[PDB]
C-alpha cells in the first residue's frame, strides 16, 4: 500500500457483439453542461464565520468595530455582491435599507472578549501586566 | 500567614506557625507549594544556610 | 486600566494581593484581612458574545 | 439559479404587450389606462431574480 498525502499542515473467436455500435444521436433538454455548471455552485459549503473566537494564544480574532455597526456593514457587502452575480449596477434583491427597522441587531466582532469586557488591550497583554507587578529581585 | 522576624543580640529568628506560635529555624516543617512561590526570593536568602 | 504604564496600578488597586513575609507594619495589616473580597464579584450578562 | 435551469417554465413578457394591443404612439396624455400599466410593468426588462 502507498502513502496518502495530507491536505493540511499538522503538529510536525470473434469478439464483436451485435449491440455495441454507437449510432444514437440524442441532444438532451435541458443540457448536461448547463445543469452541471449550476449544481457546482450549490455544492459549495458555507463560509466559516470565526470572527469573535479566540486564537492560539487566547486573543480574540477580528477587527475592533461596534457590535451593531458591524451588522450594517455586512449587509451592505451582501447587496454589492448580489449585484455582481446578477451583472447589474443595482440589485433588485437587497439585504439593506429594507422597510424593516432592525436597530437591536447584533453581530460578532473582535471588540468583545469571552468575559464580556472590552478588547482595547489584547488579553495576553493584560496577563503580562498583571503578573509583572508581583516579581522580586535579588538583594544588592 | 508566615511572617518572619529577625532575632536580636544573638537570638534566633522565628517564623509564624498556623496556630500563631513563633518557632525557630529547625525541626520538621510542612509547606504548601504556594508559600515558596509567593516568597521565592525572600525565603531563599533566609533558609538556604 | 487603560493608558500607559498600567503596570503600577495593580499594586494600588488591590492591597490584599501582596505577599506577607515580613513583620513590618504594612505586612501586619495585610495579614489581618479577609482573602475573598478582591476583584469582580458580580455581573449582569444578558447577551451571549 | 439551479431552479431556473431545471424548470420548464419560461417568462415571456411579450404576452402582456400582445394582450393589451395598445400602441397609441405619442399619446396626447398618458391617462389612457393601457399606457399607464405598461409603463409601470416595463416588460422590456428581463431580470426575474
Q: Can you give a write-up of this model?
A:
The structure is cut from a larger assembly and holds 4 copies of chain A. Helices cover 29% and strands 0% of the residues of chain A. Chain A has helices spanning 32-43, 67-85, 123-132. The first copy, chain A, is flat, with a radius of gyration of 29 Å. Chain A is built from 3 helices and no strands. Chain A is an all-alpha fold and 140 residues long. Chain B binds chain C through residues 1-5, 38-39, 42-43, and chain C through 19-23, 27-28, 31. The PDB classes it as viral protein.
Q: What's the overall geometry of chain A?
A: flat
Strand content of chain A: under 5%
Secondary-structure content class of chain A: mainly alpha
Radius of gyration of chain A: 29 Å
Residue share in helix of chain A? 25-40%
Sheet having the most strands of chain A = none
Question: Biggest interface, and residues per chain?
Answer: A-C, 12 and 11 residues
| DSSP summary, beta strand count of chain A | 0
Amino acid at each position: 500500500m502507498k502513502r496518502i498525502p495530507r491536505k493540511t499542515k499538522g503538529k510536525s473467436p470473434a469478439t464483436t457483439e451485435p449491440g455495441t455500435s454507437n449510432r444514437e444521436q440524442y441532444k438532451a433538454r435541458p443540457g448536461i453542461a448547463s445543469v452541471q455548471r449550476a449544481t457546482e455552485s450549490a455544492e459549495m459549503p458555507m463560509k466559516n464565520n470565526d470572527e469573535g473566537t479566540p486564537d492560539k494564544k487566547g486573543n480574540t480574532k477580528g477587527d475592533l468595530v461596534n457590535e451593531h455597526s458591524e451588522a450594517k456593514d455586512e449587509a451592505d457587502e451582501a447587496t454589492k455582491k448580489q449585484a455582481k452575480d446578477t451583472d447589474k449596477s443595482k440589485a433588485q434583491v437587497t439585504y439593506s435599507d429594507t422597510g424593516i427597522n432592525n436597530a437591536n441587531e447584533l453581530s460578532r466582532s473582535g471588540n468583545v472578549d469571552n468575559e464580556g469586557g472590552s478588547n482595547q488591550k489584547p488579553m495576553s497583554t493584560r496577563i503580562a501586566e498583571a503578573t509583572s507587578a508581583i516579581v522580586s529581585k535579588h538583594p544588592a | 500567614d508566615c511572617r518572619i522576624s529577625f532575632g536580636m543580640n544573638g537570638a534566633a529568628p522565628m517564623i509564624r506557625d498556623e496556630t500563631g506560635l513563633m518557632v525557630p529555624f529547625e525541626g520538621n516543617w510542612i509547606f504548601p507549594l504556594a508559600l515558596w512561590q509567593m516568597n521565592t526570593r525572600y525565603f531563599n536568602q533566609q533558609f538556604d544556610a | 486600566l487603560p493608558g500607559p504604564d498600567a503596570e503600577k496600578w495593580y499594586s494600588i488597586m488591590y492591597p490584599t494581593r501582596m505577599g506577607t513575609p515580613n513583620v513590618s507594619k504594612i505586612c501586619n495589616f495585610v495579614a489581618s484581612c479577609v482573602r475573598n473580597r478582591v476583584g469582580r464579584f458580580d455581573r449582569a450578562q444578558m447577551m451571549n458574545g | 439559479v439551479l431552479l431556473q435551469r431545471i424548470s420548464p417554465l419560461q417568462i415571456d413578457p411579450t404576452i402582456i404587450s400582445n394582450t393589451m394591443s395598445t400602441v397609441s404612439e405619442s399619446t396626447t396624455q398618458t391617462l389612457s389606462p393601457a399606457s399607464s400599466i405598461l409603463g409601470k410593468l416595463r416588460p422590456s426588462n428581463s431580470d426575474f431574480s
